[PDB]
Design an enzyme around this catalytic site. Structure first.
Site, PDB file in Angstrom:
ATOM      1  N   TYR A  55       0.858  -1.187   0.000  1.00 23.10           N
ATOM      2  CA  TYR A  55       0.000   0.000   0.000  1.00 23.10           C
ATOM      3  C   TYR A  55       0.887   1.227   0.000  1.00 23.10           C
ATOM      4  O   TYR A  55       1.765   1.370   0.860  1.00 23.10           O
ATOM      5  CB  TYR A  55      -0.947   0.022   1.211  1.00 23.10           C
ATOM      6  N   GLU A  57      -0.217   4.753  -0.695  1.00 26.34           N
ATOM      7  CA  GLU A  57      -0.913   6.043  -0.784  1.00 26.34           C
ATOM      8  C   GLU A  57       0.062   7.193  -0.578  1.00 26.34           C
ATOM      9  O   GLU A  57       0.950   7.107   0.279  1.00 26.34           O
ATOM     10  CB  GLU A  57      -2.017   6.129   0.269  1.00 26.34           C
ATOM     11  N   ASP A 201      -5.611  15.578 -24.469  1.00 21.58           N
ATOM     12  CA  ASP A 201      -5.707  14.146 -24.218  1.00 21.58           C
ATOM     13  C   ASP A 201      -5.107  13.425 -25.417  1.00 21.58           C
ATOM     14  O   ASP A 201      -5.723  13.331 -26.483  1.00 21.58           O
ATOM     15  CB  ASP A 201      -7.173  13.769 -24.015  1.00 21.58           C
ATOM     16  N   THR A 227      -3.225   7.523 -21.958  1.00 13.65           N
ATOM     17  CA  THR A 227      -3.048   6.141 -21.545  1.00 13.65           C
ATOM     18  C   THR A 227      -1.576   5.786 -21.708  1.00 13.65           C
ATOM     19  O   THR A 227      -0.849   6.439 -22.473  1.00 13.65           O
ATOM     20  CB  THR A 227      -3.877   5.209 -22.439  1.00 13.65           C
ATOM     21  N   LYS A 230      -1.973   1.663 -25.781  1.00  7.56           N
ATOM     22  CA  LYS A 230      -2.258   2.283 -27.093  1.00  7.56           C
ATOM     23  C   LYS A 230      -0.923   2.474 -27.785  1.00  7.56           C
ATOM     24  O   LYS A 230      -0.098   1.538 -27.716  1.00  7.56           O
ATOM     25  CB  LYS A 230      -3.167   3.522 -27.116  1.00  7.56           C
ATOM     26  N   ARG A 236      -1.450  -1.325 -19.143  1.00  9.10           N
ATOM     27  CA  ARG A 236      -2.731  -0.633 -19.185  1.00  9.10           C
ATOM     28  C   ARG A 236      -2.867   0.272 -17.965  1.00  9.10           C
ATOM     29  O   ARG A 236      -2.833  -0.195 -16.812  1.00  9.10           O
ATOM     30  CB  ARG A 236      -3.863  -1.668 -19.241  1.00  9.10           C
TER      31      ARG A 236
END
Lengths: 420, 420
Positions: A55, A57, A201, A227, A230, A236
């Site tokens: 974890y 964060e 974008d 992304t 692509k 991904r």
């Protein structure tokens, strides 16, 4: 019991068999879905790493859990590599997807109800640029611009008219289905006159930007989203970049604690691996081949009498305009699929046909180009596509031709490398 | 160049080394971060699958891309397995994380500005339940309930009071740092009184719910959210469940196309693998051991004179109240970290101390229980923790004691299985 002895081949045969069959499927078809690619085994190895157990964060050296010293090194490498790749001052490698990258920018810059100006779905814009069933259209006042009804090209005068009319808080540039260059300089010139932010974008064309094969939005946009999959051919996930560090601070806070919780550290390590691949000289050559292949594909189709939207392409995408041929894009995509060629139906801008049906298809070159396809191979692909389309014009039942073409596809695709 | 030749240990030594060192770090510490666990090699194998190459917007048999026949099988397996595990009618296995799972419920049921009643951060609630820095607090009218100031327990009369007063559209139950049972039937009685929706966010206790070691919210909540990691011990991601098919349709549309784009099919396959592990009889034994270990840990600390919030625990979490000892949670967690024991500082409800400092720590048993720890072992851990805390009370400098304990931590952890 002791889960560390759990091996997938033993403990979950059903899933093991599905993964094997997916590998076979990927290996045996001609993948022309424009948004798809094949990642390296190196990316896959990092993607499957036990970094998922941690974890993390917060941000490197600024986490809300102890013990992040190693995952911090992975994230810092991802950030440093992508900053070098895009020659920019700010990066956030934590977004789980392109959609979440976009939402972080919205959370950083907008309040619900704010007006946002983006490319219409009809014209080839993305869901997250203001479409009604997406958060972007549901929770904000989305207005849209569209391509010219004759040329199917972006009209900057129109965008400027709409920017003045609607005074958007955010103007978005970028697309999911558009085959030509975008002038990012013009977008910034327009937002400055109306006091708006400019988001670029570049998910589809990110690999062109990274290799200088398309103008970079970094000097022009307040926020750049993408992304990592692509054209960038990474795992991904999502990505945010900027040359504005003050806006960068706002984006950092918007992503976490604003939008996400724990980041996927294994995916971020895989992002670092993919970014290093992007930095290799061979990546530029790959994107140049992607574009060359796309032009060859478009030309082979025109040669066979089919119409290409805008008459060609400057990128990895080829849009086929099937209106004169009386074939729906849905029927075309489905017949092609049975013939071993996967692609998408694609709405022609301003067509009154339902977007469920369409009068076009969208083809893309990145996936096969990754497998080593050259121009002449995409010429062959273009003729296989034309064969199927011709069959749809001249037959109620295209089954015989589909099997014919699938035979050719099988003999063509087995000539190129894939995963060991 | 052919990227299928790219092997990580050759093309990216820096990332390879970081992964190797992360494995070592995970293996060498006593991991008491309550939200952490260790996934099986089987889950890791699916997590790293080439299913990442497939775009699969939409849902099984209703996708926006052809070619999804195999990924559809994986998602369907994930859905069927989790429905069996939680005995529910609806499941969504696409959320990228617990945070996104929660956001899908907001998009499904709420409009920006709506009143939402959730557990305050101060009482151990999550960021996504209405905290100011998070979308839930920025874009909605967040009001909170807190634990009882005397008992540190949920007071339902108080929650009911606040529900009557604020008339929330949504009431959330669930937490990130609370050591006792929650009565979901009470929560539903309360929302019915005021005409609200009820969301149960069971991310931390999902393993207890799955094995009947905690009351299920399925019969009571309109929507149930969770992470797939944490006590469920799955890959890192999110999950939504319900017994309400009508709400289910709305959640499906809210997740996509409302909030996300392409799902992570490799992670979804990994979720299916983990759900099957969850369905094994041994997983029930595992959760029971998790709880018994936590009780043993709390009791050992109490022996050593330390105070436990609520006097104990019903779950995997142990909350240490350090106020009587004059030790901050920050100093405690940091000293423990250097001693090879990782945990979190934890705010004590109603304490005037800054939440940056805190007067508590939060310990959890799932990670070490996964490695085979039993009660006697968590007793040993409790004494190691107490040794460090004793040191912080009586030493200007805890370095020497940190090394003493790290030696003992090292000797104990080496006795338990890990990844091969």
């Amino acid at each position: 019991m002791n889960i560390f002895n759990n091996n997938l081949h033993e403990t979950d045969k059903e899933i093991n068999e599905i993964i094997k069959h997916e590998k076979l499927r990927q290996s045996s078809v001609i993948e022309l879905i424009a948004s798809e690619n094949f990642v390296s085994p190196a990316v896959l190895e990092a993607q499957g790493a036990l970094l998922t157990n941690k974890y993390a964060e917060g941000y490197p050296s600024k986490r809300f859990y102890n013990g992040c010293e190693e995952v911090d090194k992975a994230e810092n490498l991802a950030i440093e590599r992508v900053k070098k790749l895009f020659n920019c001052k700010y990066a956030n490698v934590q977004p789980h997807s392109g959609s979440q990258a976009n939402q972080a920018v919205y959370l950083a810059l907008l309040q619900p109800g704010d007006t946002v100006l983006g490319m219409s779905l009809d014209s080839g814009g993305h869901l997250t640029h203001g479409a009604a069933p997406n958060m972007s259209g549901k929770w904000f006042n989305a207005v849209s611009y569209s391509v010219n009804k004759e040329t199917y090209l972006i009209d900057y005068d129109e965008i400027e008219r709409l920017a003045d009319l609607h005074k958007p808080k955010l103007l978005i540039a970028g697309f999911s289905a558009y085959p030509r260059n975008i002038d990012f300089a013009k977008f910034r010139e327009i937002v400055d006159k109306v006091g708006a932010y400019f988001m670029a974008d570049i998910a589809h064309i990110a690999g062109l930007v990274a290799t200088g094969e398309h103008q970079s939005p970094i000097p022009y946009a307040h926020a750049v989203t993408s992304t990592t999959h692509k054209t960038l051919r990474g795992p991904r996930g999502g990505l945010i970049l900027s040359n504005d560090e003050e806006i960068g601070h706002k984006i950092n806070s918007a992503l976490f604690p604003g939008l996400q919780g724990g980041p996927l550290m294994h995916i971020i390590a895989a992002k670092a691996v993919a970014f290093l691949e992007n930095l290799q000289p061979e990546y530029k050559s790959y994107i140049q081949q992607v574009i060359s292949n796309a032009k060859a594909l478009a030309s082979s189709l025109q040669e066979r009498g089919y119409d290409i939207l805008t008459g060609g392409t400057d990128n990895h995408i080829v849009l086929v305009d099937l209106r004169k041929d009386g074939i729906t894009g849905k029927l075309a995509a489905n017949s092609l699929d049975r013939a071993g060629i996967t692609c998408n139906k694609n709405a022609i801008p301003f067509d009154e046909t339902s977007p469920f049906i369409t009068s076009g298809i969208r083809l893309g070159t990145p996936a096969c180009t990754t497998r080593g396809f050259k121009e002449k191979d995409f010429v062959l692909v273009g003729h296989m596509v034309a064969d199927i389309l011709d069959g749809l014009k001249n037959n109620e039942d295209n089954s015989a031709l589909e099997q014919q073409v699938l035979n050719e596809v099988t003999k063509l695709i087995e000539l190129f490398p894939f995963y060991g």
